[PDB]
Design a binder for this molecule. Structure first.
Ligand SMILES: CC(C)(C)c1ccc(C(=O)CC(N)=O)cc1
Length: 209
């Protein structure tokens, strides 16, 4: 059973701006997603100090980068706190409304798209390089869900029947045809070294078989 939702108008407008604006410095999408993963890992680490059972779903706190040239996907996996169904459908987009407005006004005033993370809506920078984004997520207090959107004003949410993840989030970037450089090991290494060198969790870049 698949549920289809409309983005709020302001978020759809943000997504269109990211997709349509000419802006060559697309590589910053990875910094934003890794920063998001680091934030989710910080949250489960903090919560597990006052409740160690919150790590019964997995003790390891890490980030994995998995390219797949056959599927033309780049997957960012973390074992952070995960997201509830309410997070996916309503809470996070509601919060993003204010950051989107502030980001819009900053852009009109001289800012550029690389500053998106200073406004708290860095997830949507995924559409700099992806034609479709799939988010698989598992929070301790909810079931495993799959969120998905190719923009165009709508997204879907369904219960995920695939491999159980334990806890955390996978962001699967279905890359645009002209953005396959982000599947190359040397290119991902360069970007992580440039923009994510001090992330406080191990980042493992998987190799293709
Ligand atoms: C579309 C889903 C529900 C996956 C999502 C996730 C995160 C955010 C943010 O705006 C927070 C951030 N980027 O750190 C907004 C929406």
């Amino acid at each position: 059973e698949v549920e289809t939702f409309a983005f709020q108008a302001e978020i759809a407008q943000l997504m269109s701006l990211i997709i349509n604006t000419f802006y060559s410095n697309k590589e910053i999408f990875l910094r934003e997603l890794i920063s998001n993963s680091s934030d989710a890992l910080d949250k489960i680490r903090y919560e597990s100090l006052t409740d160690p059972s919150k790590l019964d779903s997995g003790k390891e706190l890490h980030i994995n980068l998995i390219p797949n040239k056959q599927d033309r996907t780049l997957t960012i996996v973390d074992t952070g706190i995960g997201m509830t169904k309410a997070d996916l459908i309503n809470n996070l987009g509601t919060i993003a409304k204010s950051g989107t407005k502030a980001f819009m006004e900053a852009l009109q005033a001289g800012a550029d798209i690389s500053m998106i993370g200073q406004f708290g809506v860095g997830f949507y920078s995924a559409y700099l390089v992806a034609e479709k984004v799939t988010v698989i997520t598992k929070h301790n207090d909810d079931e495993q869900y799959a969120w998905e959107s190719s923009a165009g004003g709508s997204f879907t949410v369904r219960t995920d029947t695939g491999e159980p993840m334990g806890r955390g989030t996978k962001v699967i970037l279905h890359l645009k045809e002209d953005q396959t450089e982000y599947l190359e090991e040397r290119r991902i290494k360069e970007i992580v070294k440039k923009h994510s060198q001090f992330i406080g969790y191990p980042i493992t870049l998987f190799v293709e078989k």
